[PDB]
């Protein structure tokens, strides 16, 4: 709680949260890429039902 403001709060807390923010976002880029696959197969389901 005092070496935070020369050190550990930076480069051990900010650069590790940022390390999370990088890898954590990759799930959202993977999860949303699955929900876009929902719509594109739903349209196949609405194409064969329209057919």
């Amino acid at each position: 709680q005092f070496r935070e403001r020369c050190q550990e709060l930076r480069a051990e807390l900010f650069c590790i949260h940022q390390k999370a923010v990088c890898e954590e976002r990759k799930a959202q880029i993977a999860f949303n890429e699955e929900l876009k696959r929902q719509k594109v197969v739903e349209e196949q389901m609405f194409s064969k039902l329209w057919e």
Partner: protein, 433 residues
């Protein structure tokens, strides 16, 4: 040991609360049925029973049984107390006089009975937190009776409402200007603060800031979910500098009749776009005063800011925000009013925001919630007052309102009430030498 009671009324109000209450459960780690997966942060929006069950502090009321059923039989079945989650008898059907006189009257006694049974379990109560609309009958007329009864039953409790304003250009209801004028007699002296969230913000912020096209209301309500979680988190999560609810009221509001702030959630960015830039305190504060990011369709350059309240979340250092405020004060374009030279707050919370599954927001190191009081919301009524008097001039759609018991003269009484409120923003925008 301090807590905030919420009430959500109207179809608009109940579904923006479903986005509010999905976020409350995913913030504190609470399952959709009530029990903790296995603190005191629950005791602001959640009551802890003998088991792990966390009954929500809200009461959802609406006169349409249709919209209340899908939350009665949805995935939040076991969460809500089934007698809290109260239904109606018949639709208010887009009529102020219906929701105020004839069909909303048989629900006041049961709603106020549940607010009493909820406020006595309360021990350190700060104030109410209202959720309604301006368009429909039960979003406007039924909440009017609520402000009528809560002002006399409680009094000194500070109530806040997150209203959804009628949009200036698009609109979905024909007689909703009538409903957005008569409600103003009961949101002026019966409401302590009134947040306005128009359907023109996420109309285009979800298009330009977020790369997703064609948004719908389940994406509209998440941004309204994020802001309320940002405001109450100072009551709820620890910080280097916290802003209580009563802290927030007396500071942002100048005058007893001027309590109509704007809103802005700055770090609204998509997942595929967020890693393309760093989100600093100075950048996310400069991106929040921009006229393409406010929550109401009104240009802030026409008006002058009275006082702005800023709530930061997560990883924010309290020197960069002071550098951000000084950098954004020295620009000439954002002009403040002369009689309030400071015009600013800061508020720090340690916990970063959560993102719901399926959401288009990307989670951030830091999130700022800018809550600005402007006199540019004077012309928020200008495109509604001209919207009003054109319909009123030839007695269009008046026979329904006077047919339900409402007197004709109460239309013009609300007309002059808003005309006086517009005069107040012309009075405060004049400099004194």
């Amino acid at each position: 040991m301090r807590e905030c009671i919420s009430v959500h009324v109207g179809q608009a109000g109940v579904q923006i609360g479903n986005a509010c209450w999905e976020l409350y459960c995913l913030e504190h780690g609470i399952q959709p049925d009530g029990q903790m997966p296995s603190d005191d942060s629950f005791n602001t929006f959640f009551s802890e029973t003998g088991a792990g069950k966390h009954v929500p502090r809200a009461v959802f009321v609406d006169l349409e049984p249709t919209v209340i059923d899908e939350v009665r039989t949805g995935t939040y079945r076991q969460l809500f107390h089934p007698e809290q989650l109260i239904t109606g008898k018949e639709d208010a059907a887009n009529n102020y006089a219906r929701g105020h006189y004839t069909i909303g009257k048989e629900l006041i006694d049961l709603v106020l009975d549940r607010i009493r049974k909820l406020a006595d379990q309360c021990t350190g109560l700060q104030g109410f937190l209202i959720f309604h609309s301006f368009g429909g009958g039960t979003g406007s007329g039924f909440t009017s009776l609520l402000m009528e009864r809560l002002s006399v039953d409680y009094g000194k409790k500070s109530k806040l409402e997150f209203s959804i304003y009628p949009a200036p250009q698009v609109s979905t209801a024909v007689v909703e200007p009538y409903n957005s004028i008569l409600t103003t007699h009961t949101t002026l002296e019966h409401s302590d603060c009134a947040f306005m969230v128009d359907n023109e913000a996420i109309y285009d912020i979800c298009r330009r800031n977020l790369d997703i096209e064609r948004p719908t209301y389940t994406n509209l309500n998440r941004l309204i979910g994020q802001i309320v979680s940002s405001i109450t988190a100072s009551l709820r999560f620890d910080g280097a500098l916290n802003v209580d609810l009563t802290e927030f009221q007396t500071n942002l509001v100048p005058y007893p009749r001027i309590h109509f702030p704007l809103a802005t959630y700055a770090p609204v960015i998509s997942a595929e776009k967020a890693y393309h830039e760093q989100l600093s305190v100075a950048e996310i504060t400069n991106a929040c005063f921009e006229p393409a990011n406010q929550m109401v369709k009104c240009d802030p350059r026409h008006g002058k800011y009275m006082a702005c309240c800023l709530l930061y979340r997560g990883d924010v250092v309290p020197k960069d925000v002071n550098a951000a405020i000084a950098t954004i004060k020295t620009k000439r374009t954002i002009q403040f009013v002369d009689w309030c030279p400071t015009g600013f707050k800061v508020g720090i919370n340690y916990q970063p925001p959560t993102v719901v599954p399926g959401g288009d927001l990307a989670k951030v190191q830091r999130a700022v919630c800018m809550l600005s009081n402007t006199t540019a919301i004077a012309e928020a009524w200008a495109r509604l007052d001209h919207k009003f008097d054109l319909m009123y001039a030839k007695r269009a759609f008046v026979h329904w309102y006077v047919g339900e018991g409402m007197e004709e003269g109460e239309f013009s009484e609300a007309r002059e009430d808003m005309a006086a409120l517009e005069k107040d923003y012309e009075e405060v925008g004049m400099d004194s030498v």
